[PDB]
Symmetry: D2
Subunit: 292 residues, 4 copies
Amino acid sequence: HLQLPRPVCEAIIRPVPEHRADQELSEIYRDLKATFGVPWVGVITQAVAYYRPFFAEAWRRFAPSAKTHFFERASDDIRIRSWELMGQSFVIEGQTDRLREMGYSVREIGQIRAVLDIFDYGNPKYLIFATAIKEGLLSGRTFGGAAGDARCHFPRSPICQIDPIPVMVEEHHAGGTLSQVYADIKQTLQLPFINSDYKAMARWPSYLEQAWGALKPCIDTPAYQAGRFDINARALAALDALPTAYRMSRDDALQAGLSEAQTDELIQVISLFQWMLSGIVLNVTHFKQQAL
Amino acid sequence: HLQLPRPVCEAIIRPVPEHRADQELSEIYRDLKATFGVPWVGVITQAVAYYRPFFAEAWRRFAPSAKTHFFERASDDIRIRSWELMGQSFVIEGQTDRLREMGYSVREIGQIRAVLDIFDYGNPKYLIFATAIKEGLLSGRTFGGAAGDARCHFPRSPICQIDPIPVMVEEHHAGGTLSQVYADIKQTLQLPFINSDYKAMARWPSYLEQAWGALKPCIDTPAYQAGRFDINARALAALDALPTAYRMSRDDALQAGLSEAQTDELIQVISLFQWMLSGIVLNVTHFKQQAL
Amino acid sequence: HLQLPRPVCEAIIRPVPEHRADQELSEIYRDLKATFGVPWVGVITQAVAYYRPFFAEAWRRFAPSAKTHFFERASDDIRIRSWELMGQSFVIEGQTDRLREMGYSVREIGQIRAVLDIFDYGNPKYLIFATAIKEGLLSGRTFGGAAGDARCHFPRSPICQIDPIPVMVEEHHAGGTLSQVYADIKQTLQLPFINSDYKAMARWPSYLEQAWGALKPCIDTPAYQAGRFDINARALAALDALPTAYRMSRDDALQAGLSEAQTDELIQVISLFQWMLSGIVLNVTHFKQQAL
Amino acid sequence: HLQLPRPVCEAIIRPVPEHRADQELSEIYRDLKATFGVPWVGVITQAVAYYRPFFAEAWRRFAPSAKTHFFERASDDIRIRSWELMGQSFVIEGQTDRLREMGYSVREIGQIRAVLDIFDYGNPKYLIFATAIKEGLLSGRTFGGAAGDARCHFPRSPICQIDPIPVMVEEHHAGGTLSQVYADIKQTLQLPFINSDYKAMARWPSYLEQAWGALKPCIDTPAYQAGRFDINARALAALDALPTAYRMSRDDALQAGLSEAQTDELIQVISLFQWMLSGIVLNVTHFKQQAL
């Protein structure tokens, strides 16, 4: 009965997407993408972006760890675990053939796998970042900092795809039918937003409904909820193990320039996204397992 | 009341899309795109591609002209005329303010214009090609070939975007309301196919539904049907003025490897697509005037 | 025996290249590239950009004309004339067989032509811009702006290559012998700088060694000097026919924030690049006819 | 005083570069790049590619292992080991200060690092592949295949740079000084060819002049020599642990269609490249530490 609570969330989330970002924000957005080695700024960071002096300083405190061999391996090990959990817990009778029947060519199915690959690789990095932000605020604690194995502090595996931004069907791009797929997900996952993951799948409307439609019955089953706690506890372990110490408390929030009250709302906001992220990692894993 | 007849189109169309093309075909596809200087193979040429040795040979007979200063200016003057025609015959309200209110940012509206630019540039080039193919078959005639102004034989203005293929929501990609928006168009336009320019617009569903919604009432008004005659007449004039003579008769079809039967079917296919291309040139013009 | 008088420029040129440009200036560079529809910022515009508030202002005033059918055709008509001129004045030996025998493959020779095309397309546009800036300052006149044919004000031929920036071997990149070919070019062309064109061709040092060596004997022959004057005059004529009036005189330069002392230097600097731009249009034409 | 014996190479090496590779071979070249996740076909694979039916068959059999977490981790640990090794064996002064003073902007130095990054990531993967071909042929043995940890069989970390092909100044591109730096490199490393990485560094000839000059004294110091053997041993150990069994014996090479004469020749060619990739791994590690 291992299970992860969806927090209270009073808070209005105010993402700054990349197509609206001003030049100052877009610089941090670029540093973020380059450092992780991902071609998309996640909604979580679009949302912490609203509290921009916090985001700026938090990222600055976190960026050194993100650049390390340790952080590459820690994220990669969360992807592997998800691949392990979902393969053991759920039946994946594939869908390459289902897609062929629908009309999809081998080229197209390639392009889809390539999109799911991006998020497969990128989400454990956002999860760990989310975790550090939320736990730093909540506990005021200093995390990581140990020397240990010197190879842990080495530069991460260096190749990366950072351009272009994946094609994403935003919520105001959406027509009616797709809007209902988008409402169906928000409700099912209990989120006020559509993940970048689904939006990029949505470029292929008929493909997204098929995939989501196979994933939906697995959400909040006990094995899913167990698996999600597991993924969550591993991001908590990566937080404890950062190569460069990370502290960003409520008081560092004030010093960064936020009111006490804005810090309270930020905590609700990051707690929501942090809870979202262990779930999307199972979610993306599922889509990718079907795709093979 | 000048009108140009929608022909009979008994014939099944069988386009080989780029994501399906094999190595041999993809190579002619690359030469096509490179010469015209467009990043997409048009449905017209996808469809004539089914009759591959005719398509191969016809393209060979036409490409010398396509590479010329003459052909660049003839295509460009067709765009200019359509801009001229639609600007006068139609009151087209600006509508970027609507898009803004729907939630589209200044950057997104930019990307949308960039897509319309592609087709605004490329469709006169496909229109003239489809005209050469059609009339060569019907009349057996040898068109152009005059020396004239030596500058007409000069290399065309050199710059092109060749990549990537635009993002198109193909018909099997399409979801619910979009399959009915696609249906709406097929019917209104009397076509069995959805054009590439709509599919590219389809990446922004909400933007398609009401760009199209604004254009639909214009189709087959007298000023529309007349503007279309004008565009069709000008492609016939560019056909007569080709700097390298083009002949591809019915008997060349047979020589190419086609049967009498297949050639009969090809004539129906090219006539339908040829008819389509003057309509789509006004259509794209309309979209693009809306988007100022 | 006709020729373009080389101006005297004692003035130091201080180009801001794209790889040192700050955010604000990159934003203007970007807009310049998107409107011209070329992938590179000219050394001409890099040197004017030093006197930044004047550059910013000459560009806002000129850009309305740059976006027009008139400006696209006028620039393109200068490319045609240079092709005509060099073709009739010079017997140019083909060099692709000699490239082949040096080791160059078909694709490579193709890459070489593609780069040449970029400058064959772009440079007349810079020539006209430079002419406008120079004459506006020398004469104080308002140029163009007559109503005339409505089509001249239409949007220009709409698709372009903006990315990536051409691979250019800068002077501080060059090793010994490439620094000697750069020295040669400078003295023969009478310039204190290396054009973007040669640096781009310099990606293939041996090809540049060849194409420059075949061009050089033709430099400042009578047929060159007369053709150059004619190219020049075409730019001056392009100036009087601009769709949207352009005035940027000394009084305007002062108002933009320049001193008296900086305006005299700017007049010198633009004067030297203006003279230059007639020569580079012919030079790449020779290049490009060598490579047929 | 440990050292890797250089093998006698009598054989003429005959690489098909990406810019000459035909359609069939380019499609093998593609798959190799999309599996390794690098944007370049290595010269080792270019030379084995001459023996094309053997090349196709050795890659079909090795590709199952290359697609695995094991292979990703194992290649990555070779990168980690060389960093560790050159770091504790050598005190390497920074060079970015001299690059600055030479004229290199912050972005250019950034670009150079990004190119170094590529090889830093890819080369271990080419080391291991080359090791499998050499040992397979020399010993007739089946390599890897034991079940072990299930995770080893999982899909590798799923993101890559596959385009564009790095800018590489080939030997028929090079001019005067470059040819002599290339000459220096060949004799110093005892190779009758230039590696992809020096030709890439060569886009910036003065950078290559500087980075190679700082390396060359270190070449064949005891420390270098001893470290190179270690890297070589770990490749040999990666070979015994391949997730999916690999056999490609001389007998196998006969079935693929090689004579006995070509197989002797192929054994000499792969042997010389096999020896070489242990060195290039240390070599670029050095450049990269020079450039921190």
